[PDB]
From TrEMBL, chains A, B:
<dbReference type="GO" id="GO:0004190">
    <property type="term" value="F:aspartic-type endopeptidase activity"/>
</dbReference>
<dbReference type="InterPro" id="IPR021109">
    <property type="entry name" value="Peptidase_aspartic_dom_sf"/>
</dbReference>
<dbReference type="GO" id="GO:0072494">
    <property type="term" value="C:host multivesicular body"/>
</dbReference>
<keyword id="KW-0378">Hydrolase</keyword>
<protein>
    <submittedName>
        <fullName>Protease</fullName>
    </submittedName>
</protein>
<keyword id="KW-0064">Aspartyl protease</keyword>
<dbReference type="InterPro" id="IPR001969">
    <property type="entry name" value="Aspartic_peptidase_AS"/>
</dbReference>
<dbReference type="GO" id="GO:0006508">
    <property type="term" value="P:proteolysis"/>
</dbReference>
<dbReference type="Pfam" id="PF00077">
    <property type="entry name" value="RVP"/>
</dbReference>
<feature type="domain" description="Peptidase A2">
    <location>
        <begin position="20"/>
        <end position="89"/>
    </location>
</feature>
<dbReference type="GO" id="GO:0055036">
    <property type="term" value="C:virion membrane"/>
</dbReference>
<dbReference type="InterPro" id="IPR034170">
    <property type="entry name" value="Retropepsin-like_cat_dom"/>
</dbReference>
<dbReference type="InterPro" id="IPR018061">
    <property type="entry name" value="Retropepsins"/>
</dbReference>
<keyword id="KW-0645">Protease</keyword>
<keyword id="KW-1039">Host endosome</keyword>
<dbReference type="InterPro" id="IPR001995">
    <property type="entry name" value="Peptidase_A2_cat"/>
</dbReference>
Amino acid sequence: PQITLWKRPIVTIKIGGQLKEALLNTGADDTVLEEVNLPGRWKPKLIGGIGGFVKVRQYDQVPIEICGHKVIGTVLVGPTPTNVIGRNLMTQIGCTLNF
Amino acid sequence: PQITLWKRPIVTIKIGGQLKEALLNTGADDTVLEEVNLPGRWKPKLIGGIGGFVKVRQYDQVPIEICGHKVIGTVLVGPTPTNVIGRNLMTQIGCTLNF
Amino acid sequence: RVXEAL
């Protein structure tokens, strides 16, 4: 699909057997979700945005289906005003900017 | 051009006669820069991101050339960790996400 | 409004 930018580029994902929506975010290196629950071990991490830093759990090799495309990568779980898919997953689906 | 997401989608801009780099950010509604000197009147605004919220100046109708494409629109000036081109300007240059 | 690194 081609997605224009007149509205926020939001897509439906499935992760951990649950359905969420999330913003395709070229401004984000990493993928950050809240209130998903992933199984197993994680590592504590801190991520930074516009107004400061937050603590997140880092999970590796998490299966995520992103607008009907199956991918595996790192998923960070923590406080965020909104769910974000970052470049680490976007490259996996072959997502580009075009102008 | 087409820009893949294996690294940060950073472009060169000219704004108010100064040259800057900025990150093409589908996750930002608005365009936020630091250390730019815009002329004239402006209104205080607060923007939010991950980590919390930042006080900014809002300037309307600011010419800005973004990868050699001339557009006009709202530019926010305030403490950001990186300069961001938002969707408000990206739609003006015809920028889309493709996968 | 304006979305991350480190």
